[PDB]
Design a protein around this ligand. Structure first.
Ligand SMILES: Cc1cc2nc3c(=O)[nH]c(=O)nc-3n(C[C@H](O)[C@H](O)[C@H](O)COP(=O)(O)O)c2cc1C
Ligand SMILES: Cc1cc2nc3c(=O)[nH]c(=O)nc-3n(C[C@H](O)[C@H](O)[C@H](O)COP(=O)(O)O)c2cc1C
Lengths: 457, 458
């Protein structure tokens, strides 16, 4: 009905003398002894330039009227699986992106009702073609004609209320599109959840564009080709290294706080004591939190992972991508500046001295901690993205954030066990740290911050 | 050559007082007393926003003097750097700054004979009541004042291979009524605002997906809890039939349980579960030690009207713990198969659905995501009631939720290690399947994490 039906490009059509297979990635559908015409209708759906009425007529020409009605009933089964694209030629093509697919041609009242483009719909270049996408939609709109882009630009630029019955004349005057083409285009836009028939919704008003997009995309064999580029430990920044103490963990396995006691007594302490946190305390903290316990290589890894490290915290598929930069503003045995921590050698190498840029970062952390007292150490957790981006297409950054949270909890518990003053940070400036430390922001950028010091008795 | 219109930023506040003049922004403010008439005329025309830098310089030179004109031309670059000046090609497009240390560089004329293409991170969307082109790699935001610019961007994105202006500009000038000079100004602005790629992207950026880079750029850059009554401190009880959970003596566990160092050094992801499933008392102790409610309090002087807030064994941004735990049980000691919801204040379990094929589908998804090791015993699904946290944090809300999920993962790992359980986090799951299972709005509460728990073999 008022749409041209085409099979999804990922669908494979296996033609046998007495059976027929339609193969997708997740599932497949096989049917035995198909009468001709049904096979002809499926072949022309693979061609994908006919209407449902035309396909039903093709079935009826060879099989009969009852078989045509049966095929008309059968087609919605394939529509539900998301195997059938709906197009207004040659203007736009909706391809499904999710199962349990449903297309709903709206009532004619849309022509006299105020509408607007969803603020979650966005136009971008998928590869070599312009596409309209939305997290609120189970469809993906390939734009075949730039005049559709002009229509979208006109109505997004339009006022809050767009009434088709009154404003369609301006569109027919500025563009060469016919009225029926425009009505089909707007109908498909509304049906693919790209348009708002209602004025506003209280549940989605709280959501931001990037937040909702990230939530929808992350919540739904590769090879590490750049393994030589991204090693397990980051190459040494500066060879001048300050050693850190290594505590005997066997004695601390009995001297330290009980896990239950540490969990029940942990609190965020932002008022630091007068005696700053010592370098030995920082060394013990880093050794108990983010050290390298052992370096291993899987005996049979098809992904060419090579060497991977084990650390006190977990990470998705190993591939520990977190570096710790202990920016020191006030330490007992160290001068002010930004440093970098190496987990395998248990050393810290300086990155920058006490420049007003490092001071800007310190001031940001101090304001984010509530301006209770002057920070002593600020650990900045940075993510070398090339470590795991190859293995996870969409779920990479959420995994990185969850690892940052794990590291936050470990920091909290260890600092509570060491009578320190821990406090996580909500967010920071990634470009400022990219400038201070000289990093490739598309290859390694800061993703977390934590404030650490000494707590008064 | 200078070919852009300078306007005052809409985000900037102009304080016009007697004998003084103030330009107020969020990060910085610039005040100046005794302003000369030429500077005043230039600032007024910048408020108008219809002159180029050369025109403003000439006006300042005619009103205050030539040296004063040069001084104003030097001074205006500092205001441009702070992101206070928008650059527009009227009436086609206006670039507004969105980041400090702002800089606009008119590209060399060679761009007309060089192949270019639209950045795949540039996206058009409707913001407020106007069309806007944005990009995480750009320091600017383009307000599209004319739909013909949208048609140009559509033709450019639709165009295949490389687009060379010198060869293909004739088709754009013939299909649309835009003038050649207007088209060159538009393309110059697009190239200068990092919206166009003259090089084949880069190997480091190819690793990045659109949504990941957008989220990373937006998150890593007093409100009032108006809807507090809709999103309370504990979620309202789903079903009145409630199963109680065992409360362990935490004063005794404060000395009997293993040390924190022992738990951190012994912890590991265990996926091979025992033949004897995890009991209900173990699940109760686990939930009581991980995500129970310890106390309900109210801030003595809270201007945000936060109201009631709870304390819990794990930390969370600004308190207001918005995470709920649904323990989907496939095989437990004294609990039938089905989905449940954990109430931490009463320390209870309330059923949500029985062993339906969709609960089994969730179990199958978790089992495949955990490597198909034995059979899963309990799967905790961590969900986030967004309305409790979204009011306070606009952009960093979801990142805070993910970090909270990570904190809860680490707490689960440590407590399960201390209790000789079999913990294992899960990378991702199906949020819409869980939304279909439990009658919840996915825009108000949706699954954001998964964890698998069972018993470890001796
Ligand atoms: C992800 C995350 C970010 C946080 N960011 C901040 C912050 O920016 N400033 C701050 O004072 N506390 C921050 N905190 C700590 C919380 O404010 C703290 O958990 C809460 O205010 C008090 O909980 P407590 O019992 O640990 O003291 C953060 C905690 C987490 C988990
Ligand atoms: C955020 C996150 C997600 C994870 N997702 C999975 C998963 O989906 N499947 C799985 O088997 N393990 C998962 N894990 C556990 C890791 O695979 C595990 O840490 C690693 O493979 C082995 O480390 P460990 O045995 O020392 O704990 C996840 C861990 C984290 C932190």
């Amino acid at each position: 009905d008022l749409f041209t039906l085409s099979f999804s490009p990922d669908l494979s059509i296996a033609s046998e003398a007495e059976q027929l297979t339609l193969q997708s990635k997740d599932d497949r559908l096989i049917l035995e002894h198909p009468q001709p015409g049904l096979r002809t209708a499926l072949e022309q759906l693979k061609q994908g330039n006919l209407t449902l009425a035309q396909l039903t007529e093709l079935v009826s020409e060879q099989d009969g009227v009852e078989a045509g009605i049966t095929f008309a009933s059968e087609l919605e089964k394939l529509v539900d699986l998301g195997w059938i694209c709906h197009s207004v030629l040659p203007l736009i093509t909706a391809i499904p992106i999710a199962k349990d697919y449903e297309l709903n041609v709206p009532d004619s009242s849309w022509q006299t009702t105020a509408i607007a483009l969803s603020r979650f719909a966005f136009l971008h270049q998928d590869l070599q073609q312009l596409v309209l996408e939305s997290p609120r939609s189970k469809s993906k709109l390939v734009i075949l004609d730039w005049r559709v882009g002009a229509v979208i630009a006109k109505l997004a630029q339009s006022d809050r209320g767009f009434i088709f019955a009154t404003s369609a004349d301006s569109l027919l005057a500025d563009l060469s599109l016919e009225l029926e083409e425009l009505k089909r285009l707007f109908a498909l836009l509304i049906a693919t959840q790209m348009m708002d028939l209602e004025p506003e919704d209280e549940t989605i008003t709280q959501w931001k564009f990037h937040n909702l997009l990230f939530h929808h995309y992350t919540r739904l064999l590769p090879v590490f080709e750049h393994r030589d580029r991204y090693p397990y430990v980051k190459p040494v920044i500066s060879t001048q290294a300050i050693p850190l103490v290594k505590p005997d963990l066997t004695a601390l396995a009995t001297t330290d706080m009980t896990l239950t006691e540490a969990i029940e007594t942990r609190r965020s302490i932002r008022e630091y004591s007068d005696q700053p946190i010592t370098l030995a305390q920082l060394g013990e903290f880093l050794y108990r939190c983010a050290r390298v316990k052992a370096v291993y290589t899987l005996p049979e890894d098809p992904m060419q992972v090579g060497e991977s490290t084990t650390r006190p915290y977990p990470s998705g598929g190993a591939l520990y991508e977190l570096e710790i930069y202990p920016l020191v503003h006030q330490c007992g045995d160290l001068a002010a500046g930004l440093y970098h921590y190496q987990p395998l050698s248990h050393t810290l190498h300086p990155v920058a001295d006490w420049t007003p840029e490092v001071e800007s970062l310190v001031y940001d952390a101090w304001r984010a901690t509530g301006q209770q007292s002057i920070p002593q150490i600020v650990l900045i957790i940075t993510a070398r993205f090339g470590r795991l981006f190859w293995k996870y297409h969409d779920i990479a950054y959420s995994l990185i954030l969850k690892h940052v949270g794990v590291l936050y909890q470990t920091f909290y518990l260890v600092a509570t066990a060491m009578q320190l003053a821990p406090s996580a940070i909500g967010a920071g400036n990634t470009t400022k740290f990219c400038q201070i430390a000289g990093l490739n922001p598309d290859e390694e950028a800061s993703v977390g911050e934590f404030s650490l010091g000494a707590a008064k008795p």
